[PDB]
Enzyme design. Structure first.
Site, PDB file in Angstrom:
ATOM      1  N   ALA A  24       0.771  -1.245   0.000  1.00 30.33           N
ATOM      2  CA  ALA A  24       0.000   0.000   0.000  1.00 30.33           C
ATOM      3  C   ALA A  24       0.802   1.295   0.000  1.00 30.33           C
ATOM      4  O   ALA A  24       1.605   1.634   0.866  1.00 30.33           O
ATOM      5  CB  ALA A  24      -0.955  -0.034   1.196  1.00 30.33           C
ATOM      6  N   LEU A  71      -0.485  -6.000   1.687  1.00 25.98           N
ATOM      7  CA  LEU A  71      -1.598  -6.542   0.934  1.00 25.98           C
ATOM      8  C   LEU A  71      -1.130  -7.232  -0.319  1.00 25.98           C
ATOM      9  O   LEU A  71      -1.609  -8.349  -0.601  1.00 25.98           O
ATOM     10  CB  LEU A  71      -2.648  -5.468   0.598  1.00 25.98           C
ATOM     11  CG  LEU A  71      -3.927  -6.002  -0.093  1.00 25.98           C
ATOM     12  CD1 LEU A  71      -4.637  -7.073   0.710  1.00 25.98           C
ATOM     13  CD2 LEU A  71      -4.856  -4.845  -0.433  1.00 25.98           C
ATOM     14  N   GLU A  96      -4.533  -9.663   7.250  1.00 27.64           N
ATOM     15  CA  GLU A  96      -5.461  -9.218   6.213  1.00 27.64           C
ATOM     16  C   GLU A  96      -5.186 -10.003   4.922  1.00 27.64           C
ATOM     17  O   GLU A  96      -4.217 -10.772   4.840  1.00 27.64           O
ATOM     18  CB  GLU A  96      -5.278  -7.701   5.959  1.00 27.64           C
ATOM     19  CG  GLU A  96      -4.170  -7.435   4.952  1.00 27.64           C
ATOM     20  CD  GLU A  96      -3.687  -5.985   4.967  1.00 27.64           C
ATOM     21  OE1 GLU A  96      -2.618  -5.732   4.378  1.00 27.64           O
ATOM     22  OE2 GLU A  96      -4.335  -5.104   5.533  1.00 27.64           O
ATOM     23  N   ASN A 125      -9.276  -3.498   0.387  1.00 29.67           N
ATOM     24  CA  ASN A 125      -8.772  -4.777   0.816  1.00 29.67           C
ATOM     25  C   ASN A 125      -9.809  -5.900   0.651  1.00 29.67           C
ATOM     26  O   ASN A 125      -9.490  -6.938   0.033  1.00 29.67           O
ATOM     27  CB  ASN A 125      -8.315  -4.752   2.255  1.00 29.67           C
ATOM     28  CG  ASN A 125      -7.119  -3.914   2.598  1.00 29.67           C
ATOM     29  OD1 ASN A 125      -6.659  -3.047   1.863  1.00 29.67           O
ATOM     30  ND2 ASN A 125      -6.599  -4.210   3.815  1.00 29.67           N
TER      31      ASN A 125
END
EC number: 5.3.3.8
Lengths: 248, 248, 248, 248, 248, 248
Positions: free
Chosen positions: E63, E104, E136, E79
């Protein structure tokens, strides 16, 4: 809180909606407060039963409505929070239905373990289709469970009440006291009087052990319903339909 | 297809069995066709409700029977296909029960979200034990769900009808129109008339959101029932009992 | 065993409680024996139905009570064993309710696939809260399944009977024979007479195939309930409450 | 059967592929026979371990290929049957990999509990993509379990072997005997010699208890893979690609 | 989009990160765009494989960071959206790791079916603990699956890289091309050259059938991880730790 | 307790086995005590990591053995209790393997999130087959998870150690300190020294959030393994084999 009181009487933690003038409409902070009373009851080792009682002619008319309008995050947070508190509560939840319940407060009545009605005019209304919204407060699971899946589609799809006859037909109500709607107060007292007689003799921790085993049948499904109901609603909020409808 | 028609009226995709002379007996290709109408309805973004209507005195008498006799593969393919189409449909399925349904077509009535009856002579018959077969069309899950597990064993084990009284007792029927069996046509119209009034005002995409959340409670169990029902039947077919029985 | 007999009549393996003088109270070894009769029935390839019949005015008054008092291990072993035998049985279990059943024997009546009542005075009592115990014999799953979750909390939490009206309202009873309680023997015969007529014509292995598919809906949940009910009770036994209460 | 023998030696039920001239290619009836030997081993209360041994340079080259061509039903029945026998077997399955295994017989090697290799030239090949087919013999679950999901996609998507290095890197092989491929017979004897020493002292029923607890981790997933692999393949067969490819 | 291109070459839908000057840092809209390219690839019936290629020395630094600061809703939406697109994709996802991936974008590399590395300096870094955040992009499931649960705790708890050696030790990388980091372009071409040879001969729809069966092992767990990862993070955002840390 | 100490150092709750003369053999009450230290650590809001350290040449030789012999109930209660405490712990469990662990204490090493070894002579031994017992301490799930299912059958079925090489090959050990077995004390200090450097900078509550999400992948399976391992063992105890074997 001015609209909600509580007291403890032996093994009964009693919660009471006392705003009959506004039909016990509840705001976001009133649902938070309700959720915090269930946490107090849940941690009190003397309490075995949490009785939810109201006042006046209605049990509750539901949510009281009066990009800061992203105020819907505090609306969804309050729903998830109080739904979660009802779902995980370990004490016997008993609802004294003194009249109709609508919306989120109708959802909490469906999460109670035992329900008593004042008379045959009580009803439960879930107006999600008329508000451009979807199921909430765990009703995705609780309505098909306690009323059957076809009845559930008829009520939800067409915004129709779950009436007394449907309630009795599914055994949602353990006992109708057949008393006038002008006195919730006598209905509240006579339920507690009858609860005081039925617990005599019993081993109360046994009530909690059974509940714990009983709640495990659907605990996953209730917790997942609390989550996917929120998730799935976000896009209804992003479209904006609820925002018009929430005004007339 | 000559035996089955369809039309669209606002948000209602209407499917109609129109072979009252043969009691709307259906062949394998008629079940395929039914399955393809549900795909057309499911892809039409204007449609919100799929109404299944029939004609005459019966809703349907079920499968119409007239090593090439390994023709049972096309019988099992047709059952799985149309059962699957009812299971995954995303629009509100509403059955207009104009009379008795038997077999696979009784199974599809049990997969509808909402059911209305013409009068109190309707019944659902699942004659699997008298045909040397087992549950099909997802009835392994749908009958215990919508009628209760003991009632289900009584009907299935002894080849007995699920009658109107049992239907009302489990809330399988949302409303009985109490009209003569000689006019399904007026019963078909009065249901659509009542559906046109109840959708006024509502946010229709809300009906679809609720259904999607509601269907997820049992979608795995319905899909697995569609598969294990077929698997488990193969050996009944290999023995040959259904083949005798399917002739008299 | 002197208190329990059995015989086989075509496709019916018939088990009969024949100790009406003691209200067919049963001891640990009588529950073991019951479990071994279900194993004999389950392995007999001629048997398709196992009928459980009793005698006198009661179906059964439940467990007959007269650190060696660590005799509770043989009490928990006997409960798990006979509950497990009812859970896994592959033949159609049919209970002839000739009167009230209490305790563990009330739990086994709830595990039967089909139940018939002699008359409207029958009831099922689960006095776990009055014995300082918790659910047993798979009632954690069977009561909410067959009577609904709110009704279940009302009966279990306050030690109240599941009466005939509640039974009929949930379809737990397939047929009430409306006969005097002074003759279980004629009620036992008339059920078997009616069972002999309803199986004529049918393909019996079909009854077994359906049952197998039907039992898979809840087999995990029943097996886990048998285990967690025992686990969770150990601490009630270690406290000692059941031991006082089990004496008066 | 001429291609497959078996014998019992104390607690070891030994099965041996003895057709080295045809690379122990196996036909449908040879897979049925293999499945019936596992049933004999599974019911023998003296047997604790079932050893699968082969001969020659290959463990097995897989399925031996020579609307009657609806002969694919007997091909799918044979795969499901022998896969199911490996999945549910309760005795310790030990594969003696004397060389490469391809196809369905490579799938059965992946279902064994313990695998030993003759030398570092062994490999497992699953040529489903080159046959216009999909996973079979429970490989949908067994390959990602025992080799990891990325390695699995590389081998399956591009029709590439699971070689010795990959096998050792995932611990699929418990011990490499490092012996020439010209003598499977000495490799077969030295494994049994080593098995006879390692069981001395042990309580053998303990091996079965552990296995039963161990197999329950994935038993559902293996049984469902056996079913959905068949289901999903039907349409590959209906298209006809496998039929061309199965000829050159 | 200026930072991301795509093209189609026979059965390969090729996506390429082409911003080597900023280490292919990606913004929220770049993750949305990535998600929309996977939808284009997923609907193209000619495409069987989706190759994710980058440029320069890094695959991606993750990111790119530059009550309106309630800008974290658009960060969590992005996300969930692109994670969901990787989770449900039905075509074979192949990552060309031309260098390190962080955040991510490291999570999306772990969701690819097959991974190839340029050389032994590649690594995957999940700095959630150093950002006051939690797992995540489905890493809750993907890291323990593909690297093992202990290794996973060591990397995540102490903010340490998943290096090449760990990658090879778990078989996360199908092939290391051992080429200089100064030319991702030649590494990108030589992977596609090798992919063009390995698909020759194969029945490509077979690749899709296997993937579909393979993805069903964990599809529930991945979808639930996408949801509970978001849910559980909200309170980290409400505290404010990420907001400080996201600035230096 | 004289054999086990504990202290708290910032965010590390340190537990230490300090009975090197008896190879840190542990009795039932020592496993209870261990379980109560994990409850103290789990409730301390300052603690984020619970480090399990031992002393001398062995980490632990396992259970120390010296109808009252129904003393096996206190043996099974102690196993379930301490296994359950390791399973549900919410703080990062880190084992300092200073040498071999056998039995129940080898099972607890497999339940730790992160493991460090003093040197390459460490091993884990699960001698269940040589004691006439079955898996315990959640090893039914933990061994196949962290070592792979084939390796697991080889070790368990034949009572063979999980050695260092197997440990490194599955990534069970995060780092080998390569230090002499004569000084566990310096190995204990150098791990804590390295833990003090790696937590600097990090947001510690993030470690707990990740763990909570990570533990949910297998929490059901671990809890069920704790229960079915006990259940399934009872019959081994009733036979009496463990009782002989537990004496030499």
């Amino acid at each position: 809180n001015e609209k909600i009181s509580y007291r403890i009487e032996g093994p009964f933690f009693i919660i009471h909606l006392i705003n009959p003038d506004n039909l016990n409409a509840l705001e976001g902070e009133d649902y938070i407060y309700l959720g915090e009373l269930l946490e107090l009851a849940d941690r009190n080792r003397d309490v075995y039963f949490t009785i939810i009682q109201s006042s006046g002619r209605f049990f509750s008319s539901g949510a009281d409505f009066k990009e800061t309008s992203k105020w819907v995050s505090n609306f969804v947070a309050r729903n998830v929070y109080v739904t979660d508190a009802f779902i995980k509560h370990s004490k016997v939840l008993i609802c004294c239905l003194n009249g109709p319940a609508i919306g989120l407060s109708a959802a909490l009545v469906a999460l109670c373990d035992i329900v008593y009605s004042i008379n045959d005019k009580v009803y439960l209304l879930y107006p999600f289709a008329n508000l451009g919204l979807i199921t909430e407060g765990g009703t995705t699971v609780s309505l098909p469970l306690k009323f059957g899946t076809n009845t559930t589609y008829e009520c939800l799809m067409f915004n129709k009440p779950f009436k007394y006859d449907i309630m009795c037909e599914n055994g949602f109500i353990s006992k109708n006291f057949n008393m006038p709607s002008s006195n919730a107060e006598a209905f509240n007292a006579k339920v507690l009087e009858e609860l005081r007689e039925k617990v005599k003799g019993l081993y109360l921790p046994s009530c909690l052990g059974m509940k714990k085993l009983l709640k495990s049948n659907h605990i996953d499904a209730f917790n997942k319903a609390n989550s996917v109901e929120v998730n799935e609603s976000l896009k209804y909020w992003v479209d904006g339909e609820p925002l018009k409808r929430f005004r007339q």
